[PDB]
Design a protein around this nucleic acid. Structure first.
Ligand SMILES: [Mg+2]
Ligand SMILES: [Mg+2]
Ligand SMILES: [Mg+2]
Ligand SMILES: [Mg+2]
Ligand SMILES: [Mg+2]
Ligand SMILES: [Mg+2]
Ligand SMILES: [Mg+2]
Ligand SMILES: [Mg+2]
Ligand SMILES: [Mg+2]
Ligand SMILES: [Mg+2]
Ligand SMILES: [Mg+2]
Ligand SMILES: [Mg+2]
Ligand SMILES: [Mg+2]
Ligand SMILES: [Mg+2]
Ligand SMILES: [Mg+2]
Ligand SMILES: [Mg+2]
Ligand SMILES: [Mg+2]
Ligand SMILES: [Mg+2]
Ligand SMILES: [Mg+2]
Ligand SMILES: [Mg+2]
Ligand SMILES: [Mg+2]
Ligand SMILES: [Mg+2]
Ligand SMILES: [Mg+2]
Ligand SMILES: [Mg+2]
Ligand SMILES: [Mg+2]
Ligand SMILES: [Mg+2]
Ligand SMILES: [Mg+2]
Ligand SMILES: [Mg+2]
Ligand SMILES: [Mg+2]
Ligand SMILES: [Mg+2]
Ligand SMILES: [Mg+2]
Ligand SMILES: [Mg+2]
Ligand SMILES: [Mg+2]
Ligand SMILES: [Mg+2]
Ligand SMILES: [Mg+2]
Ligand SMILES: [Mg+2]
Ligand SMILES: [Mg+2]
Ligand SMILES: [Mg+2]
Ligand SMILES: [Mg+2]
Ligand SMILES: [Mg+2]
Ligand SMILES: [Mg+2]
Ligand SMILES: [Mg+2]
Ligand SMILES: [Mg+2]
Ligand SMILES: [Mg+2]
Ligand SMILES: [Mg+2]
Ligand SMILES: [Mg+2]
Ligand SMILES: [Mg+2]
Ligand SMILES: [Mg+2]
Ligand SMILES: [Mg+2]
Ligand SMILES: [Mg+2]
Ligand SMILES: [Mg+2]
Ligand SMILES: [Mg+2]
Ligand SMILES: [Mg+2]
Ligand SMILES: [Mg+2]
Ligand SMILES: [Mg+2]
Ligand SMILES: [Mg+2]
Ligand SMILES: [Mg+2]
Ligand SMILES: [Mg+2]
Ligand SMILES: [Mg+2]
Ligand SMILES: [Mg+2]
Ligand SMILES: [Mg+2]
Ligand SMILES: [Mg+2]
Ligand SMILES: [Mg+2]
Ligand SMILES: [Mg+2]
Ligand SMILES: [Mg+2]
Ligand SMILES: [Mg+2]
Ligand SMILES: [Mg+2]
Ligand SMILES: [Mg+2]
Ligand SMILES: [Mg+2]
Ligand SMILES: [Mg+2]
Ligand SMILES: [Mg+2]
Ligand SMILES: [Mg+2]
Ligand SMILES: [Mg+2]
Ligand SMILES: [Mg+2]
Ligand SMILES: [Mg+2]
Ligand SMILES: [Mg+2]
Ligand SMILES: [Mg+2]
Ligand SMILES: [Mg+2]
Ligand SMILES: [Mg+2]
Ligand SMILES: [Mg+2]
Ligand SMILES: [Mg+2]
Ligand SMILES: [Mg+2]
Ligand SMILES: [Mg+2]
Ligand SMILES: [Mg+2]
Ligand SMILES: [Mg+2]
Ligand SMILES: [Mg+2]
Ligand SMILES: [Mg+2]
Ligand SMILES: [Mg+2]
Ligand SMILES: [Mg+2]
Ligand SMILES: [Mg+2]
Ligand SMILES: [Mg+2]
Ligand SMILES: [Mg+2]
Ligand SMILES: [Mg+2]
Ligand SMILES: [Mg+2]
Ligand SMILES: [Mg+2]
Ligand SMILES: [Mg+2]
Ligand SMILES: [Mg+2]
Ligand SMILES: [Mg+2]
Ligand SMILES: [Mg+2]
Ligand SMILES: [Mg+2]
Ligand SMILES: [Mg+2]
Ligand SMILES: [Mg+2]
Ligand SMILES: [Mg+2]
Ligand SMILES: [Mg+2]
Ligand SMILES: [Mg+2]
Ligand SMILES: [Mg+2]
Ligand SMILES: [Mg+2]
Ligand SMILES: [Mg+2]
Ligand SMILES: [Mg+2]
Ligand SMILES: [Mg+2]
Ligand SMILES: [Mg+2]
Ligand SMILES: [Mg+2]
Ligand SMILES: [Mg+2]
Ligand SMILES: [Mg+2]
Ligand SMILES: [Mg+2]
Ligand SMILES: [Mg+2]
Ligand SMILES: [Mg+2]
Ligand SMILES: [Mg+2]
Ligand SMILES: [Mg+2]
Ligand SMILES: [Mg+2]
Ligand SMILES: [Mg+2]
Ligand SMILES: [Mg+2]
Ligand SMILES: [Mg+2]
Ligand SMILES: [Mg+2]
Ligand SMILES: [Mg+2]
Ligand SMILES: [Mg+2]
Ligand SMILES: [Mg+2]
Ligand SMILES: [Mg+2]
Ligand SMILES: [Mg+2]
Ligand SMILES: [Mg+2]
Ligand SMILES: [Mg+2]
Ligand SMILES: [Mg+2]
Ligand SMILES: [Mg+2]
Ligand SMILES: [Mg+2]
Ligand SMILES: [Mg+2]
Lengths: 122, 137
RNA sequence: GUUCCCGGGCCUUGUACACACCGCCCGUCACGCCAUGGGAGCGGGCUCUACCCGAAGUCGCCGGGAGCCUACGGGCAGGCGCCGAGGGUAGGGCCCGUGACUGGGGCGAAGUCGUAACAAGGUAGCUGUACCGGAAGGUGCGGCUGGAU
RNA sequence: GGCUAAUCCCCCAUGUGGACCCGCCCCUUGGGGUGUGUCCAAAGGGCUUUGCCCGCUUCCGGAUGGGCCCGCGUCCCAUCAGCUAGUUGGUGGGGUAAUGGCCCACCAAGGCGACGACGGGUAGCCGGUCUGAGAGGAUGGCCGGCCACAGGGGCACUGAGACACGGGCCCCACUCCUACGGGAGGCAGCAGUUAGGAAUCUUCCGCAAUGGGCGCAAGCCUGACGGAGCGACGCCGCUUGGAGGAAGAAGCCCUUCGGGGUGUAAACUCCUGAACCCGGGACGAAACCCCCGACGAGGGGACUGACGGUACCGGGGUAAUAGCGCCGGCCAACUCCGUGCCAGCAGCCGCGGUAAUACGGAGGGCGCGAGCGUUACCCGGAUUCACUGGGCGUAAAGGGCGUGUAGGCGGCCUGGGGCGUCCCAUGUGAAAGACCACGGCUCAACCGUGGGGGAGCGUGGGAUACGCUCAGGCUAGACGGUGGGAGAGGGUGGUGGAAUUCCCGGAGUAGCGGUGAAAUGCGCAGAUACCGGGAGGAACGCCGAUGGCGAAGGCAGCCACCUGGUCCACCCGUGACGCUGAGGCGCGAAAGCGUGGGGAGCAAACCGGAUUAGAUACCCGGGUAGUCCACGCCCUAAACGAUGCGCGCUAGGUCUCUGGGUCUCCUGGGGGCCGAAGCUAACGCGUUAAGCGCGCCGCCUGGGGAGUACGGCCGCAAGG
């Protein structure tokens, strides 16, 4: 632009766009599973990824991930979620926190147990 | 034509990039004051008021370095750099305290002050500020 | 004899191919997931206007067929009046949530149909517009080269 | 209903003084002074008692705390563009401490807005905090300042002060208690309960200190405050020991089975002594008061500690918690097994399909350490909104072209002013925080003392170069005269011939047409091919060009009229009159639309024939809109040089068009090619810049969704 143009129009400080809308300001959000199931991921991978359909306390009803081997979640299970998509599972933009509420930690994990809600074994 | 000074500095910058002996600029008491500093600080040999087809100009005698050995014989410049600061578009003034040091001392900054055209050094000695006309090295 | 069919050598030209033309790639139709527009309407928020009614309270008038106090050319009680929180009637404005159904959109994919584009892509391509066709598209008119030879 | 006191209310008196109206002087917005008139004061109590102490009254000054007013600064949406009836001003009154439409009556027709009014959204603002090299960005919790509010609203009363959190009246919503007749409440005080939430504390101790209120003083009140409790929430200090101790135990991991590793690590030896046990035990607190003196100056006296039997000081004394993330590249740390595109990992690129350092475990290793990781958000990296500090030929990006409004910007010389600008002197810029030094807690975190500033604004004085303004000159920019030139530049009106088609006369016979080859089609009802006549419409062959003209779209036979731009020479006239250009206004290829004409050729749609798997196409035969004319719409484009306009500067060769000269050639103005310097990611650009520079405008900010939706304006519709 010209200097004049800057005086007249100024530069435009463009806003940030939240990648965790359902969280609505919060670090975490509690919710309840309506639908628990497995869904096949996109190219170039194949699996049965574990997901929960959760109705939040913030009013949003979103699709959350169930990290780890095995779980106990079923319908009506209460759950806490945190941010973070699962790159390959489109529509999934949140993660369920293991070791919170009706979500038990992983059975038999020995490595990196905070990330999977597992107590320190004897 | 909207800027005499910017035209002036530019008439030179083109002339030095192809090593002309001189080049002429349309005359002004303000250009004489700037060429004066440009004379004394030794970026040019000097200048003289000539006349072209009935019209007043200033002929400016350019100054360069020595021939060089190598593929590019072209001698080093004396005015490596010359460019307006304050412009009609955006006037630029500095108080004494924020007067700049061009190129860690090895260059100059020309000024228009209420005491006359002065360099970064001079202005600091006299203690005055002014419109920062340009910078040279 | 080297035009034609297969294979190869050298120079050159186009390319969106490099998994290298047994390359790439376009749109409909079928299925599933997500978001969005429209939609008889339904529900909520805020707001504006006109008028009816109107508490407390200030202020103004009266204070007499008339009470109490006198400090009686007075005061208080008491009466009336204006504005007035808000309640009520009626019609408007912006926004939000939602709705049988509907329009295309994103993604998914191992589906169906054709092969429009990239080589002169086998009718050079793209283009605004217009009419038409299951779909990519075709054709008319004018335009561009970002078109091989 | 009845009595009673006072520092409770009222009348008279005194008038230092004050208030008010009228007059004069000074001043200069209602400030100071004075004269006539008028109005206004008051309270006692207590001791040691013809004397002091707490209080009372009127007035002036001070100090402190406020009210009101002005200049400047303060976020997002223009898809909110026009807003306003107490509205804007005047007059007269009401009201207050006081100005004022603050309020009322009357009078005038005004006030505000692209320098963003009105409207919608969001937020209490600042000192500061965080980040950042800075500029800037983000933010306003704690702490200090100001504001606003006290269940939701309205209102006043008492008062120096409130329209009053723990005061009042009313209305509403809500909850409660009841003896069922009625009445009460307001935690956004300190704790505490509940609800919501991912989430945020003890119904503690104390007036000892600091401070506040009442009081002569004692003293009383103080959930302010001083401390205590809980929470790794944060920062800081500290611990889980130190020295010795094998060519090196077992176990576990790896191995070529020789061995490598955990590892001085452990064991074990000596040394120290967190925790805990005993004794001492604070600083914080000397004032008020009492005493002599004088209830003062000064000197002396005693009482007072919630935290706390705590910190700390001294003696004794136990080897005394370690966890968490990571080891494909970024990025520091690698091996074995298990799995077999499964299970799973994932910030990005990517891992997993039988030898995975990337998944799960183990060994080993790397990083931190009462912590480590994760999620969320803020700045940084992002010169990725670019002021510092970016871009637009082909990557995202020049408006289709003009003309012009506001605005931004402007040639050479001289003077006045001194607005911007620079300097000096001064006031303000509180405290905490930041920074530098020092010092106190054993250090540190924390805290104390001092030091150094700044912008920015108020005032006084100075400076005059540049930008500003005013004034007076100039001719280099710009326009004009005079005289000429080239051109498909534009509008109107005419008119020429070539050719296609149809019709008419002639003459003539068996095919013509078309494609790759064919068919459809036309033809003995006489086609094609040929000669003559006629009708009508559209487009202009050769000239013609790598040409000319126009701002762009675009403009081509010829003739006349009307009209625009533009170049040249003379250097005659005006004297900066200039450049650009948000809005606005006009022009704007084709197609398309409206009303009316016209319709020869061509030809979307459509029909038929071929091709083909199909052929809603390409090829062939037909054919309607339309293509043409007038008037009025639409306003789009690969509207292109994918290159906004103007000006100045920076080698040349060559080809061409068009003026002028001293006609070899020189000089202007346009149109191409190659190239200096330079630019460029490269391709390429290069005096027709895409080079070096200035001014103003338009535009870009990852692909798709999408030139879509919604809103808005425009259009007959299409649609812009
Ligand atoms: Mg719930
Ligand atoms: Mg895979
Ligand atoms: Mg359950
Ligand atoms: Mg994340
Ligand atoms: Mg892991
Ligand atoms: Mg600058
Ligand atoms: Mg061959
Ligand atoms: Mg060969
Ligand atoms: Mg080849
Ligand atoms: Mg193929
Ligand atoms: Mg809807
Ligand atoms: Mg709707
Ligand atoms: Mg409704
Ligand atoms: Mg409604
Ligand atoms: Mg009514
Ligand atoms: Mg009323
Ligand atoms: Mg009476
Ligand atoms: Mg009354
Ligand atoms: Mg009302
Ligand atoms: Mg109402
Ligand atoms: Mg009511
Ligand atoms: Mg819907
Ligand atoms: Mg739908
Ligand atoms: Mg749908
Ligand atoms: Mg094709
Ligand atoms: Mg083709
Ligand atoms: Mg094609
Ligand atoms: Mg087309
Ligand atoms: Mg069909
Ligand atoms: Mg067709
Ligand atoms: Mg064109
Ligand atoms: Mg008595
Ligand atoms: Mg009296
Ligand atoms: Mg705006
Ligand atoms: Mg008003
Ligand atoms: Mg009135
Ligand atoms: Mg709001
Ligand atoms: Mg708020
Ligand atoms: Mg930076
Ligand atoms: Mg804030
Ligand atoms: Mg906060
Ligand atoms: Mg505060
Ligand atoms: Mg309130
Ligand atoms: Mg409440
Ligand atoms: Mg209330
Ligand atoms: Mg209230
Ligand atoms: Mg009082
Ligand atoms: Mg008051
Ligand atoms: Mg109160
Ligand atoms: Mg109150
Ligand atoms: Mg208040
Ligand atoms: Mg309260
Ligand atoms: Mg009760
Ligand atoms: Mg009762
Ligand atoms: Mg009652
Ligand atoms: Mg209570
Ligand atoms: Mg809860
Ligand atoms: Mg609590
Ligand atoms: Mg606390
Ligand atoms: Mg106290
Ligand atoms: Mg006292
Ligand atoms: Mg008490
Ligand atoms: Mg207490
Ligand atoms: Mg406290
Ligand atoms: Mg050994
Ligand atoms: Mg060893
Ligand atoms: Mg061993
Ligand atoms: Mg060994
Ligand atoms: Mg050791
Ligand atoms: Mg003490
Ligand atoms: Mg011992
Ligand atoms: Mg780490
Ligand atoms: Mg690192
Ligand atoms: Mg490494
Ligand atoms: Mg398995
Ligand atoms: Mg393996
Ligand atoms: Mg990894
Ligand atoms: Mg591993
Ligand atoms: Mg620590
Ligand atoms: Mg943390
Ligand atoms: Mg960032
Ligand atoms: Mg930045
Ligand atoms: Mg810039
Ligand atoms: Mg850039
Ligand atoms: Mg253009
Ligand atoms: Mg336009
Ligand atoms: Mg213009
Ligand atoms: Mg102007
Ligand atoms: Mg100006
Ligand atoms: Mg000037
Ligand atoms: Mg001047
Ligand atoms: Mg000045
Ligand atoms: Mg200062
Ligand atoms: Mg300070
Ligand atoms: Mg120290
Ligand atoms: Mg500083
Ligand atoms: Mg002067
Ligand atoms: Mg003048
Ligand atoms: Mg001239
Ligand atoms: Mg005939
Ligand atoms: Mg016959
Ligand atoms: Mg004939
Ligand atoms: Mg031209
Ligand atoms: Mg002249
Ligand atoms: Mg315009
Ligand atoms: Mg048009
Ligand atoms: Mg047309
Ligand atoms: Mg039509
Ligand atoms: Mg028509
Ligand atoms: Mg017609
Ligand atoms: Mg057909
Ligand atoms: Mg057919
Ligand atoms: Mg056909
Ligand atoms: Mg045809
Ligand atoms: Mg029609
Ligand atoms: Mg048409
Ligand atoms: Mg072109
Ligand atoms: Mg052009
Ligand atoms: Mg364009
Ligand atoms: Mg482009
Ligand atoms: Mg422009
Ligand atoms: Mg430009
Ligand atoms: Mg010539
Ligand atoms: Mg000539
Ligand atoms: Mg030329
Ligand atoms: Mg040409
Ligand atoms: Mg070139
Ligand atoms: Mg070169
Ligand atoms: Mg040339
Ligand atoms: Mg460029
Ligand atoms: Mg995006
Ligand atoms: Mg996008
Ligand atoms: Mg549109
Ligand atoms: Mg369009
Ligand atoms: Mg619309």
């Amino acid at each position: 632009p010209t200097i004049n143009q800057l005086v007249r129009k100024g530069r435009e400080k463009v806003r940030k766009k939240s990648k965790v809308p359902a969280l609505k300001g919060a670090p975490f959000r509690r919710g309840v599973c309506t639908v628990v199931r497995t869904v096949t991921p996109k190219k170039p991978n194949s699996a049965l990824r574990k997901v929960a359909k959760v109705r939040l306390t913030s009013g949003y009803e979103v699709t959350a991930y169930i990290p780890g081997e095995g779980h106990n979640l079923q319908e009506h299970s209460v759950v806490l979620i945190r941010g973070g998509r699962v790159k390959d599972l489109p529509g999934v933009r949140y993660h369920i926190v293991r070791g919170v509420y009706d979500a038990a930690g992983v059975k038999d994990r020995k490595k990196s147990r905070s990330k999977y809600g597992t107590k320190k074994p004897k | 034509l909207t800027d005499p000074i910017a035209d002036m500095l530019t008439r030179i910058r083109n002339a030095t990039r192809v090593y002309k002996e001189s080049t002429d600029v349309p005359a002004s008491r303000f250009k004489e004051e700037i060429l004066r500093i440009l004379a004394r600080e030794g970026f040019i040999k000097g200048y003289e008021r000539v006349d072209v087809d009935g019209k007043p100009y200033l002929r400016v005698y350019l100054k360069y370095g020595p021939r060089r050995q190598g593929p590019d014989p072209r001698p080093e410049q004396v005015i490596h750099h010359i460019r307006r600061i304050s412009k009609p578009g955006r006037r630029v003034y500095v108080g004494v305290k924020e007067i700049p040091r061009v190129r860690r001392g090895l260059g100059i900054a020309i000024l228009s002050t209420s005491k006359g055209v002065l360099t970064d050094r001079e202005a600091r000695k006299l203690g005055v500020g002014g419109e920062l006309i340009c910078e040279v090295w």
